[PDB]
């Protein structure tokens, strides 16, 4: 499962996301418990612009291991990219509960409120992002 996964990663790092999918699928046939392989499969679909597929595989990775602030953040991103701002907010909140110093999660939470026309809330979360990254 290791070589298949790293073979997938070598294609991923080049922007060859569909080749990466084939090899991540092979890694997961051998080790269906690999949160890493699920997560990176979801990343490959995200990069392919298939947010519904990314969400299914991120959900599976988060089922096996609900600890990465990064994984909740990327689940929020996938929902954001398909216009599901309620769900994006839910998952960005979960990300921030695990990593309050994520300027990225505060910023995207701002953006989700901005997209809903909630500019008062957007401004609150952009200000939090700027406390952590004042060079944003
Ligand atoms: Ca083996
Ligand atoms: Ca290349
Ligand atoms: Ca080459
Ligand atoms: Ca390709
Ligand atoms: Cl990783």
Tokens of 47: 């990069």
Residues in Cβ contact with 97 at an 8 Å cutoff, skipping those fewer than 6 apart: none
- Ligand 1 center to residue 33 CA distance, Å? 14
Residues 6 or more apart from 30 whose CB is under 8 A from it? 1, 4
Domains and CATH numbers, the chain: 1-65 (1.25.40.10), 76-136 (1.25.40.10)
Sign of CA dihedral 101, 105, 109, 114: positive
Ligand 2 centre distance from Cα of residue 44 (Å): 16
Computed on alpha carbons and rounded to an integer, the radius of gyration of the chain in Å comes to 16
Q: Resolution, in Å, please?
A: 1.4
CB 27 within 8 A of CB 34: yes
Residues with Cβ within 8 Å of residue 129, at least 6 apart in sequence: 103, 104, 106, 107, 110, 136
Give the sign of the dihedral formed by CA 47, CA 50, CA 54, CA 55.
positive
Instruction: Please tell me the distance between residue 112's alpha carbon and the centre of ligand 5 in angstroms.
Output: 25
9 CA from centroid of ligand 2 (Å): 12
Pick the closest to residue 39 from 19, 15, 12 (CA basis).
12
- Is 74 in contact with 104 (CB distance < 8 Å)? no
Is residue 39 within 8 A of residue 58, CB to CB? The reply is: yes
DSSP-assigned states of every residue in 85-116: HHHHHHHHHHHHHH-TT-HHHHHHHHHHHHHT
């Amino acid at each position: 499962a290791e070589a298949w996964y790293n073979l997938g990663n070598a294609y991923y790092k080049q922007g060859d996301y569909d080749e990466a999918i084939e090899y991540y699928q092979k890694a997961l046939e051998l080790d269906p418990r690999s949160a890493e392989a699920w997560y990176n499969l979801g990343n490959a679909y995200y990069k392919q612009g298939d947010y519904d597929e990314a969400i299914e595989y991120y959900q599976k990775a988060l089922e096996l291991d609900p600890r990465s602030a990064e994984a909740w953040y990327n689940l929020g991103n996938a929902y954001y990219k398909q216009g599901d701002y309620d769900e994006a907010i839910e998952y960005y909140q979960k990300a921030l509960e695990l990593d309050p110093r994520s300027a990225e999660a505060w910023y995207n939470l701002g953006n989700a409120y901005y997209k809903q026309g909630d500019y008062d809330e957007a401004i609150e979360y952009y200000q939090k992002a700027l406390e952590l990254d004042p060079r944003s």
